[PDB]
């Protein structure tokens, strides 16, 4: 590799997740075939974003305003807060067409191992948002990390007068028990819902 500009692009691109050396090069030689209007629009989009994009002060969902669109929106159920690990989960639980409440983003998951505690995550700004006649849905992951963060959150929010809930551990949609993990099945079972009471 010689032209430093190409060596420079491969590097920066390869610094991105899900894109190795071989794929970065594959990518640099595609950018070469493109017309300058796009490269600029890609660059600008990146920058516009890096500048315009900031974390919401209330919940910490990503936006470019004073409050996130969720916080602003008045038709949104102002009584339920869905705590989540990452802003991407907000989209996931949003494009899920079954939740119109408020969200809250701990920008990560707890992990005692790496001294990462409820001070490296936006857990503080959540407390004041929680009151009575409200529900706090805990939608953190299901790794020992998500499981741990949630139980920590449960403990913390307890003293405030809200209903705390955790999303359902269970078999995913479109699967058969045979290929479902053991611990999942045991949870899908113990957490079984009654569809009819005699």
Partner 1 sequence: SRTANRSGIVIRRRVTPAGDIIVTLLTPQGKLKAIARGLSSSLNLFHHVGVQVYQGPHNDLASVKQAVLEGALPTLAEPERYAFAHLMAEFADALFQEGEFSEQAFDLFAASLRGVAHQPDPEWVALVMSYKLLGLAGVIPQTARCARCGAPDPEHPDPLGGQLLCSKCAALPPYPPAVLDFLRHAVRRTVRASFEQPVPSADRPALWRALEKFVTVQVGGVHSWRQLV
What pairing do the DSSP bridges indicate for beta strands 102-105 and 62-63? Answer: unpaired
- State which residue, 75 or 190, has the beta carbon closest to partner 1: 190
Restricted to residues 15-74, the positions that interact with a second copy (CB under 8 A) are 15-19, 22-23, 25-34, 36, 38-53, 61-65, 68-70
Please say whether the beta carbons of 103 and 126 come within 8 A: no
91 binds a second copy (CB under 8 A): yes
Per-residue b or e along 13-30, where b marks 16 or more CB atoms closer than 10 Å to that residue's CB: bbeeeeeeeeebbebbee
Report the nearest approach of partner 1 to the CB of residue 28 (Å).
Answer: 9
Nearest to 70 by CA among 59, 57, 83: 59
**Owner of token pair 């963060």:** 149
A 10 A CB-CB count for 83 gives 25
75 binds a second copy (CB under 8 A): no
4 binds a second copy (CB under 8 A): yes
Restricted to residues 111-170, the positions that interact with partner 1 (CB under 8 A) are 111-115, 142-145, 147-148, 151-152
Report the nearest approach of a second copy to the CB of residue 20 (Å).
Answer: 10
Report the nearest approach of a second copy to the CB of residue 103 (Å).
Answer: 10
- State which residue, 2 or 179, has the beta carbon closest to partner 1: 179
């Amino acid at each position: 590799k010689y032209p430093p500009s190409l060596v420079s692009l491969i590097r920066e691109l390869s610094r991105l997740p899900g894109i190795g050396p071989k794929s970065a090069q594959r990518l640099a030689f595609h950018l070469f075939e493109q017309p300058r209007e796009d490269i600029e629009r890609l660059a600008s989009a990146l920058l516009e974003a890096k500048r315009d994009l900031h974390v919401c002060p209330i919940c910490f969902n990503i936006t470019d305003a004073e409050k996130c669109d969720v916080c602003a929106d008045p038709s949104r159920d102002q009584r339920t807060i869905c705590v989540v690990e990452e802003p991407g989960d907000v989209i996931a639980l949003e494009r899920s067409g079954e939740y119109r409440g408020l969200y809250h983003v701990l920008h990560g998951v707890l992990s005692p191992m790496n001294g990462v505690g409820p001070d490296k995550l936006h857990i503080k700004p959540l407390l004041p948002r929680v009151g009575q006649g409200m529900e706090v849905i805990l939608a953190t992951g299901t790794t020992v990390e998500g499981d741990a963060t949630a139980l920590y959150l449960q403990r913390l929010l307890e003293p405030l007068g809200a209903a705390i809930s955790r999303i359902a551990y269970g078999v995913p949609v479109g699967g058969s028990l045979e290929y479902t993990d053991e611990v999942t099945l045991g949870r899908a079972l113990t957490g079984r819902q009654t569809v009819s009471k005699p």
